Design a protein around this ligand. Sequence first.
Ligand SMILES: NC(=O)c1ccc[n+]([C@@H]2O[C@H](COP(=O)([O-])OP(=O)(O)OC[C@H]3O[C@@H](n4cnc5c(N)ncnc54)[C@H](O)[C@@H]3O)[C@@H](O)[C@H]2O)c1
Ligand SMILES: NC(=O)c1ccc[n+]([C@@H]2O[C@H](COP(=O)([O-])OP(=O)(O)OC[C@H]3O[C@@H](n4cnc5c(N)ncnc54)[C@H](O)[C@@H]3O)[C@@H](O)[C@H]2O)c1
Lengths: 367, 364
Amino acid sequence: ETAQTIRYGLIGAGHMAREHVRNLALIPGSLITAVADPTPSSLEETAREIGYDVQTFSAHKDLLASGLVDALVIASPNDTHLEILKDIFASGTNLPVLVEKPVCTSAEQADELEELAATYTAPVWVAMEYRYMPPVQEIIQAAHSGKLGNIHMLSIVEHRFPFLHKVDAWNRFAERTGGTLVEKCCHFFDLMRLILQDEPTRIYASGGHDVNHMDEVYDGLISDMVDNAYVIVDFKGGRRAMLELSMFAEGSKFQERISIVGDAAKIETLIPVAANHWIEGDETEATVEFSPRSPLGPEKHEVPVDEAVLAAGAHHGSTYYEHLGYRKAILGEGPVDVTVADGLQSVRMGLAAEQSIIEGRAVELHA
Amino acid sequence: AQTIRYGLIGAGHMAREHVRNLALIPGSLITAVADPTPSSLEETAREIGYDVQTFSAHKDLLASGLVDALVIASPNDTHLEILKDIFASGTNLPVLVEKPVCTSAEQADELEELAATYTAPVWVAMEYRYMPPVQEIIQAAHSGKLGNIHMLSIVEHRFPFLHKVDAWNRFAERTGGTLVEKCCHFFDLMRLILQDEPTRIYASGGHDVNHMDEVYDGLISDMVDNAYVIVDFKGGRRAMLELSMFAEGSKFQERISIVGDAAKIETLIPVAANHWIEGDETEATVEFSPRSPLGPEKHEVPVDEAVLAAGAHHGSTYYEHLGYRKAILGEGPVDVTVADGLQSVRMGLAAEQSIIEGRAVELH
Ligand SMILES: NC(=O)c1ccc[n+]([C@@H]2O[C@H](COP(=O)([O-])OP(=O)(O)OC[C@H]3O[C@@H](n4cnc5c(N)ncnc54)[C@H](O)[C@@H]3O)[C@@H](O)[C@H]2O)c1
Ligand SMILES: NC(=O)c1ccc[n+]([C@@H]2O[C@H](COP(=O)([O-])OP(=O)(O)OC[C@H]3O[C@@H](n4cnc5c(N)ncnc54)[C@H](O)[C@@H]3O)[C@@H](O)[C@H]2O)c1
């Protein structure tokens, strides 16, 4: 049981970086060595969380020259993801990267990243982790095993609280985030491609900035970000999906609903609000419900998460499994489950959707 | 109880639901029943349980002098002819005309002009609003208990289209399309709950599972069996409809969620006892979820055993009739007007048009 050891470098050391550290703390062989972030308060809090001594830098290139690291984790703001990847690619360090979603934030960016990512050879994983939520694992297995028959429809409903406060308010601005439908919803456009095993062809969306962040001023600016939307997505093989997002529906005991409908059965999972954002002492569990057409007879069970794994994140235990998988890719004992290609599609879908909200019209996509 | 003499024009599946419901309302007497299919007159006569005059054509029924009020429950594309005829009859009879009130744009234009000059009660039989659980949702929305409303979602997961006389419901040309035939109730609910008028609509649907390649009397089966619809409104609200006609395993057939800036509310309507398993009668729920303070409240909403048993629309048909009665007597208004019917149809038609051309459609 000699744990092989991986030395992790964190580039960006804020809210999500600290979720990575709590999760790596549950995985033997996991050691944080370097942490780069140009905001001192961020380095301080992240160092407190790690709980043991680490080298800190205020710039990533220094971290890259340190020789302190076996693998990278990028958790900086969305629009910075490309620069840091270009830099990692040109470093000659050939380091594995776990880069947070969205992998980028514009069409120009995605084009560039597509060409560049081809020549880089080390594991590059886009940190879209929703698929590893245990409840959502079942849903996906069921869909893939043909237990639903031919799949026709996928609905995703997220009802949640306004965008949280982040360092320098980066998440309040379309140009830094890619828009709400890239920032928040890329996870969901990915899930669509994964579950339906198909590529989108058309997308229409209707959304607004109707409720949130109205009294928050940032050097004379208000948030330009969407806080509610419906999205319909058409696919190559005649399947269709729908996304409902509200960022002011936080009263809802269940934050996510995902239903898949095939021609033999339907399946539906309900994901609760994380314990951190919900009332104290009212922890509900996630459910999965299987509903065959014939014979009638729905079966529903709770899908529990290990008390520790659940407590380490606000994404229902997913971050832990993401890291077990990143580890295996780093060691060569497993694949990159969520590629750059995956990331680029999810972003392009979200960008199309942001475009549809602006022009009041559907938008075509290319394979 | 004053007595109302009802004429049924069309005497199939839905006509028999009206009869079971009128049977629960004192003062209610069926006198005439018109339908061009003998077997239909026979079954409907068995259901009524007492003697009635039958005709094979509606104008005969209209001249009979047997009736105080009409109920049209014929196939969708016949609704206009019968209404034109009722209007020109000089009988000045109250009409309860089944949804959809018509099936094309030409039809709706015509009916709009004609219905203006007719003076007797004309009520469109979109009854979903009277389902007790749906009553709450609407009161909550109207009382401001949700705050300013931004989103309304409606999910129907159900069984394929049933078998009907002469297969009329298998053809877009006879029905107006699935989004008119099945979904007009829902586009109406949108206007009622949001208290607003739609401005744009986009939809994506297909004929992917059910009733592929059925020919019957010149037409080919062509009806949509799954669809998503987004509707934009004048006041910056938006609604979404999800329909699957092959999701009948779902213990809950309808889900309706409203999201405002102070709270969310959501009702779940179970499959009617007729279409569900024998052992497992479940009840409808309503769940209120305020943003601040957190604390969702959920209760079941029961229906009177009798009222529920008389229909497959969760007690709504009964209340529709209590209200039609009051309009007939002059002791009450027309809750669901022609205008209401025309909007719901135009919404559904726009949506059918959107599915065809891959593009959103404006509304007036
Ligand atoms: N996968 C998920 O479930 C999930 C959840 C939340 C956030 N995220 C992603 O994590 C990333 C950061 O989100 P967050 O909530 O931690 O935000 P945060 O603002 O709390 O943390 C961002 C940090 O990055 C630092 N930073 C800024 N510019 C930088 C640069 N040029 N180089 C390096 N670091 C820089 C900031 O100083 C800040 O400390 C984003 O990509 C976001 O989309 C993912
Ligand atoms: N409100 C609801 O919830 C609801 C539910 C079901 C049906 N409906 C409506 O009921 C109507 C009929 O559907 P159904 O299920 O009762 O159908 P059905 O096929 O069981 O009955 C229709 C009857 O109309 C008869 N008919 C045909 N042409 C006619 C004509 N020109 N004049 C008079 N009768 C004629 C047929 O012979 C048949 O007996 C449709 O408008 C449908 O939308 C409403």
